[PDB]
Amino acid sequence: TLSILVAHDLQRVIGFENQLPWHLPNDLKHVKKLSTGHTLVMGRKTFESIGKPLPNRRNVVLTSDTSFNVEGVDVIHSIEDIYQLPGHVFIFGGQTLFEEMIDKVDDMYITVIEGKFRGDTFFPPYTFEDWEVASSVEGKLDEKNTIPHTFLHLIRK
Ligand SMILES: NC(=O)c1ccc[n+]([C@@H]2O[C@H](COP(=O)([O-])OP(=O)(O)OC[C@H]3O[C@@H](n4cnc5c(N)ncnc54)[C@H](OP(=O)(O)O)[C@@H]3O)[C@@H](O)[C@H]2O)c1
Numbered sequence: 001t002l003s004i005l006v007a008h009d010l011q012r013v014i015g016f017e018n019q020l021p022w023h024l025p026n027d028l029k030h031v032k033k034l035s036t037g038h039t040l041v042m043g044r045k046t047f048e049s050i051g052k053p054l055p056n057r058r059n060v061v062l063t064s065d066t067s068f069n070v071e072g073v074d075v076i077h078s079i080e081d082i083y084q085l086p087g088h089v090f091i092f093g094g095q096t097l098f099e100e101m102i103d104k105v106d107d108m109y110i111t112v113i114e115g116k117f118r119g120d121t122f123f124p125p126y127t128f129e130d131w132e133v134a135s136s137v138e139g140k141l142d143e144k145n146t147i148p149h150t151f152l153h154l155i156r157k
């Protein structure tokens with residue numbers, strides 16, 4: 001299965017200055033739960049943002065840099081290489097990867113951040129005419145998690 005994994009706000013902002021615009025520990029827990037034991041594919045900027053491969057899953061980085069050879073990371077140089085990756089593969093970002101893959105994936109695990117943030121990078125527009133809501137779950141709010149959010153699983157119709 002090939003899936004998108006993304007958190008975006010009410011206006012589809014995903015990032016600002018190579019970081020996330022929000023602090024939301026529960027979304028990181030969600031990412032951990034979904035992708036542990038599986039594969040993440042990310043663009044080079046997203047990788048450099050996170051700084052190191054995420055533990056307990058396969059980290060694959062897409063880059064044109066033929067000098068990229070980082071410990072604990074697999075490298076690919078073409079979108080086409082993604083389709084040769086075994087198992088459950090999650091497209092992990094960023095904007096460029098999401099733009100290249102939204103028409104290709106089977107489903108999407110979206111955390112809708114129910115706020116309006118300043119962004120410089122966006123998830124591409126999409127319509128519920130194309131996507132079935134397999135599940136929609138409101139995130140619980142507390143002292144550490146203060147922004148309303150909804151976990152959506154969308155499956156291509
Ligand atoms: N909210 C979220 O769910 C989420 C998730 C991830 C990231 N983000 C945010 O997204 C932003 C980064 O997005 P971005 O679009 O600037 O960067 P990106 O997608 O992370 O990385 C772009 C880089 O990926 C490589 N790449 C992409 N397609 C390629 C292809 N077909 N062939 C070869 N290389 C390819 C290139 O690397 P080279 O230049 O090295 O060739 C390109 O410059 C940041 O703000 C980050 O915080 C948000």
Ligand SMILES: COc1ccccc1-c1ccc2c(N)nc(N)nc2c1
Pocket residue numbers: 005006007018019020027028031046049050091092093110111
């Ligand atoms: C730059 O992105 C991050 C920085 C620090 C911690 C976590 C993230 C990060 C990266 C990718 C993500 C992705 N594809 N989906 C969701 N729902 N959350 C993410 C969070």
